[PDB]
Design a protein around this motif. Structure first.
Motif, short mmCIF file in Angstrom:
data_model
loop_
_atom_site.label_atom_id
_atom_site.label_comp_id
_atom_site.label_asym_id
_atom_site.label_seq_id
_atom_site.Cartn_x
_atom_site.Cartn_y
_atom_site.Cartn_z
N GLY A 141 0.80 -1.21 0.00
CA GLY A 141 0.00 0.00 0.00
C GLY A 141 0.83 1.27 0.00
N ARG A 142 2.15 1.13 -0.01
CA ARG A 142 3.00 2.32 0.04
C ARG A 142 3.91 2.47 -1.19
NH1 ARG A 142 2.41 4.87 4.14
NH2 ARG A 142 4.41 6.00 4.23
N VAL A 143 3.46 1.93 -2.32
CA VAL A 143 4.15 2.15 -3.59
C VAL A 143 3.18 2.85 -4.50
CG1 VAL A 143 5.31 1.17 -5.58
CG2 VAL A 143 5.54 0.07 -3.36
N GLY A 144 3.65 3.87 -5.22
CA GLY A 144 2.77 4.55 -6.15
C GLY A 144 3.17 4.28 -7.58
N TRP A 145 2.19 4.29 -8.48
CA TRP A 145 2.53 4.31 -9.90
C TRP A 145 1.48 5.04 -10.73
CZ3 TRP A 145 2.28 -1.59 -11.64
CH2 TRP A 145 0.98 -2.07 -11.42
N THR A 146 1.76 5.19 -12.02
CA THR A 146 0.93 6.02 -12.91
C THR A 146 0.60 5.27 -14.19
OG1 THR A 146 2.87 6.95 -14.03
CG2 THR A 146 2.05 8.09 -12.07
N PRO A 147 -0.25 4.24 -14.07
CA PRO A 147 -0.55 3.30 -15.15
C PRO A 147 -1.04 3.98 -16.43
CG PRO A 147 -1.48 2.53 -13.09
CD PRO A 147 -0.98 3.92 -12.83
N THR A 148 -1.70 5.12 -16.30
CA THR A 148 -2.28 5.74 -17.49
C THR A 148 -1.27 6.64 -18.18
OG1 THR A 148 -3.23 7.57 -16.19
CG2 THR A 148 -4.62 5.61 -16.56
N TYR A 149 -0.11 6.81 -17.55
CA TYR A 149 0.88 7.77 -18.05
C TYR A 149 1.73 7.21 -19.19
CZ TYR A 149 4.34 11.50 -18.15
OH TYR A 149 5.16 12.52 -18.55
N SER A 150 1.82 7.98 -20.27
CA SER A 150 2.47 7.55 -21.49
C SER A 150 3.90 7.03 -21.31
CB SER A 150 2.46 8.67 -22.54
OG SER A 150 3.10 9.82 -22.05
N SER A 151 4.70 7.71 -20.48
CA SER A 151 6.09 7.29 -20.28
C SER A 151 6.16 6.01 -19.44
CB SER A 151 6.93 8.38 -19.62
OG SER A 151 7.00 9.54 -20.43
N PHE A 152 5.19 5.82 -18.55
CA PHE A 152 5.11 4.57 -17.79
C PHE A 152 4.82 3.42 -18.74
CE2 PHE A 152 2.50 1.21 -15.99
CZ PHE A 152 3.27 0.77 -14.92
N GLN A 153 3.95 3.69 -19.72
CA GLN A 153 3.60 2.70 -20.73
C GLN A 153 4.81 2.45 -21.65
OE1 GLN A 153 -0.05 4.48 -22.26
NE2 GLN A 153 -1.16 4.04 -20.36
N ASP A 154 5.56 3.50 -21.95
CA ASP A 154 6.83 3.34 -22.66
C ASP A 154 7.78 2.44 -21.89
OD1 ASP A 154 5.96 4.97 -24.71
OD2 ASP A 154 7.16 6.72 -24.12
N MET A 155 7.86 2.65 -20.58
CA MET A 155 8.75 1.86 -19.75
C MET A 155 8.39 0.37 -19.78
SD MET A 155 9.76 2.31 -15.78
CE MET A 155 11.49 2.68 -15.67
N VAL A 156 7.09 0.10 -19.73
CA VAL A 156 6.60 -1.27 -19.81
C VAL A 156 6.91 -1.90 -21.18
CG1 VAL A 156 4.59 -2.77 -19.61
CG2 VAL A 156 4.86 -0.85 -18.02
N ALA A 157 6.82 -1.11 -22.25
CA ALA A 157 7.19 -1.61 -23.57
C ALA A 157 8.69 -1.90 -23.60
CB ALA A 157 6.80 -0.61 -24.65
#
Length: 308
Positions: free
Chosen positions: A132-148
């Protein structure tokens, strides 16, 4: 009579365009859409395209343009200007670069203890009691870039493993990076993968925030390159080339690092202290073809795993 299709936000773009206009007497018309829509619009317009320049938020979107044979090879001396991230194609020029980094609360997290690989983050979270103490930004384009980027580095299945392991931490999703960094500040979460310049921005406001880089090569240090290309349809090749040249000019590059907080790609600029040198950035980032990041695949996977 310059016509720019820009996937970069207007607030970022307009000041630079104004300057060019006033200093060259060239009248510039800029259309602002996502890299996505621009790619659509160019394929739609065909040879009947007004556009002279494509200025993208991502090198991915430019790889596609060069992939649909849309861009004109560049002035040998142009591709000489930037320090790195020039595309083999030589069909567009990189303008800034941004880095994925791991932001954290120095009060709550010890730098020494953070994992050398993004892949180990969930294990870190589990051991360090960060449920419960980790944040992320799933909808964010660069986060999606990172996953790619992870898919291209480690394969789809390792990446899927990472996603589900992150989910199992009940991480909190934020609508934006400033929101997440606010949370980090407030102590609602302890850490979050972000873009380096959000951190630089916070630090400039006086907020001490930790910035962790993963080991060299790691997916967690993904280089996010912005760039510009000369369209084949251009009938304004002098003016257009002048502008590319202008983007890479010390004064414009100072605007990028200063006003925006991103990495400049040329020398002749005064560099913030909250950035490692450009050269070490390169050293840190995964070695991938930034024109070929499997973004569609990342999206499909993010929806399947129930992250999106």
């Amino acid at each position: 009579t310059l016509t720019i299709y820009s996937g970069r936000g207007q607030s970022l773009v307009e000041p630079l365009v104004k300057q060019f206009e006033a200093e060259t007497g060239i009248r510039v018309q800029v259309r602002y859409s996502t890299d996505a829509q621009i790619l659509a619009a160019l394929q739609e317009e065909g040879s009947r395209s007004p556009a002279d320049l494509f200025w993208a938020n991502t090198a991915g979107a430019l790889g596609q343009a060069s992939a649909k044979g849309l861009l004109r090879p560049l002035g040998e001396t142009l591709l000489e200007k930037p320090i790195a991230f020039v595309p083999a194609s030589r069909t567009w020029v990189p303008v800034t670069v941004r880095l994925r980094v791991l932001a954290y609360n120095p009060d709550r997290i010890k730098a020494e203890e953070l994992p050398e690989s993004l892949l180990d983050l969930p294990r870190f979270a589990r051991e360090k009691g960060l449920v419960g103490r980790v944040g992320w930004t799933p909808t964010y384009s660069s986060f999606q870039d990172m996953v790619a980027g992870m898919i291209a580095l480690y394969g789809e299945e390792k990446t899927r493993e990472w996603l589900l392991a992150m989910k199992a931490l009940a991480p909190k999703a934020y609508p934006s990076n400033p929101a997440m960094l606010d949370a980090i500040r407030a102590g609602e979460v302890d850490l979050g993968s972000t873009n380096h310049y959000y951190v630089v921005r916070f630090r400039r406001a006086g907020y001490r925030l930790g910035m962790h880089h993963f080991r060299d090569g790691d997916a967690g240090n993904l280089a996010l390159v912005t760039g510009a290309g000369l369209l084949k349809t251009s009938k304004n090749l002098a003016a257009a080339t002048r502008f590319l040249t202008y983007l890479l000019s010390p004064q414009a590059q100072q605007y990028f690092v200063g006003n925006i907080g991103e990495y400049p790609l040329v020398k002749g600029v005064a560099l913030d202290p909250n950035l490692l040198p450009l050269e070490e950035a390169l050293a840190k980032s995964p070695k991938l073809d930034l024109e070929k990041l499997p973004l569609d695949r990342a999206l499909r996977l993010l929806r399947e795993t129930g992250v999106l």
